[PDB]
Amino acid sequence: DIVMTQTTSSLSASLGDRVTISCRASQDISNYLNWYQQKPDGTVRVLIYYTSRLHSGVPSRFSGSGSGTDFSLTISNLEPEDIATYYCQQYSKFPWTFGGGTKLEIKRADAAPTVSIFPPSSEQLTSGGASVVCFLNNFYPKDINVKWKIDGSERQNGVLNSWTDQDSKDSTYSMSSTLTLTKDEYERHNSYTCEATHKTSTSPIVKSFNRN
Amino acid sequence: EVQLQESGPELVKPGDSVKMSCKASGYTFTDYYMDWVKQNHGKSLEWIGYIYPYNGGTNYNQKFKGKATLTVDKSSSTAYMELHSLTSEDSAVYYCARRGRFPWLAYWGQGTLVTVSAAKTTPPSVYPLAPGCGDTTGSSVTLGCLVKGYFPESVTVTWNSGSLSSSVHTFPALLQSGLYTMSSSVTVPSSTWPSQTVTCSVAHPASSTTVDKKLEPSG
Amino acid sequence: NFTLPPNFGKRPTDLALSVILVFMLFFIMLSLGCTMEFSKIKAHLWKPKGLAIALVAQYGIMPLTAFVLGKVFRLKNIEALAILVCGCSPGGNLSNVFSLAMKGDMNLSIVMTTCSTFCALGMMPLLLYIYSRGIYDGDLKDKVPYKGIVISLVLVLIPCTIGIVLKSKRPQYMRYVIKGGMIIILLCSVAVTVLSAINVGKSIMFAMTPLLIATSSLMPFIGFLLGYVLSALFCLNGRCRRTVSMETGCQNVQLCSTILNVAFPPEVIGPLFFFPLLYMIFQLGEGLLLIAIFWCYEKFKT
Amino acid sequence: GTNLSVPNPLGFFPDHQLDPAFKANSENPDWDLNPHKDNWPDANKVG
16 A cells, blocks of 8 residues: 655645645655646546646646656646645555645735634523634634633633635635533633634734623 | 536435445446545545446455445446445545546546434524623624534525625534534624624524524623 | 456465466476477578478468457457457467377477567567557557566476486486376376366356357467468478477467456456467367377378 | 566466466566556447
8 A cells, every 4th residue: 555645735826826736655656646636616627647648628737747756746827726625646556545635725914813702692501501712813824723721721622623714805714713611610610711822923812701 | 528427415324325326428438437536524535446337347445345335327327336334434525536548537526425423403503692891892893693503514694684795704514512513703893783783694494494683782 | 247256366276276387387398398309409490491481370370360350250349459469479388299299390399489489579569560450559569578478488498408408318217207297297287177167167157258259269270270281382291280280270378368467457358358268278179189180090091 | 568477388367477486376466567557448349
């Protein structure tokens, strides 16, 4: 079994720039690699076969060649249509493994997320549970991290984070961090505060919520 | 032009077999291999196996040997795949591809989504959330609506009242324990929400339930 | 609905079958070269009339008859290609023992076999290129083994020259050595028949097809008849007629299987994966029938 | 070329070779180096 590895999981490309997607093989395959492109709405399409040949229909801007264990896929000028997930597949051995991890995104200036905490609803408490959510909005680098102070009780056991795909009017993502809880301990910890840290900013941003 | 059409979304309890159909068209069918590829939720592809329509010759991956059977039905030109004993570990989209001449996958189907769960359909529970005692209005205030508990992933929520199209964020559903949770956020100019009602409407066609409620400012 | 056995290549029975085939080849070649002379081989080399006519017959009849049979029988593109590769293949070493059964000037037989193998490694891609045009526009020129052919030629010539040296040096080992070799050959042959029957199983019913059986039946018989006719027409000795014919009739079918396996996936070549086996068994049966007929004819001449 | 099989004159299967170490009969037969096999769409078409 050949393990196919791709160097980068997410790559920023901007527009009218060429992105070289690098795929590395566990062992030598000698020019038996294919390239596939999966648009956000499924529709997987094959771009390059035999590492040097364009499939009939794909634009002539798609290129990329390599031999041995290192392979590349060049795009030249990058149109908005060429924003998708790219895969490298080998067929040297029968299992026919895939690369599995290259994603593209649009470059823009860094932005500080808009942070806002939300106290649990009144009817939520009567249901028999407790949930607090802090929202991060319109931040470009999607690799931020979030924490919960809980008055010096930093925990990550029961936290859930939901990402968001890049929009069209902008190029920034969003956050949905929830802290699932039941009753009889939500009031046992008094106040809570979401702690989102962005490496772009030297210091994090805090919103503190108080029962009273 | 060759085009492949799949069966459609499926929902099966654990341990109950399912079948995937791939209606080929645009070519004479019985001269090209048909490969099946499974994509995990994260987005990693694995090759399951192939079938030769002319004689039904099949060869599966080692992992999928136990739980993958491929049939062709050359009369109707619709390849099939069966999974037999499905656990919760296998899910997400399965693709049928037509290998062309040399060993490369040429044309792909739209993909069939398979979900394995024992949970029944449940109407969502809608919890409205408003800013607390901070009252940091500034220039604009962000509002939202939160739902949870609905099993089938067919929820849609639209404000339809002060939404103003833009400044609306939606988030994918998450699996806490058998049930899905999702939320949405909206940004409104200051002094508008405390005076003009915004509400949040959520529709769940699978359970045929619609909830439209407003949120009073906290105080 | 053609399905190969679940584990065809990797099985103890298949490895055993290959081992017995190798042992059969070695012992057959040793006991078969134990009846040659170096001087006669040199004389046949220095008089290339028989070698030239044998090569002309092989490489101008077998590919041509394969092409004509494929065109006449209206076979599929893959089926017509499978017979063509068999026709272009060199004459196998079965011709040597077959000619031994008909007292056919074994030195000429081994000379023809060796030179035919060499000319095969030289010109088989050429014959494939000029005969395949019309079916399989693909290359198929780099799929024919090249180093393997010469390696096999040397590895089968080694026991032959060992036996020749043994005969020339000291002949009193013949009775002890020859009988033992014959015994080994008989045991290996019955074992190889049983093992092939066990391994193939019921999958042979798929590849019999009336057309495949027909072409694999006419091709060796046509080769025998045409080679004999040409050798007789060229005013050759009666002894050389039998060996020339029974060499141009036999073929090395391993190359056809290997080339087809390399060039195409197993599912494309499914039903005719057993075509080399059918050709081998049909040529063996026809050769045995011809040997029996010739022996009966000789009995009539007493 | 792409074929490195040592043919056996009395052979009818691809694994019948003269190699002493019978790697063809093992789980990793390396006598063929042509993964770029041709599916030949018109293999079963007459003419």
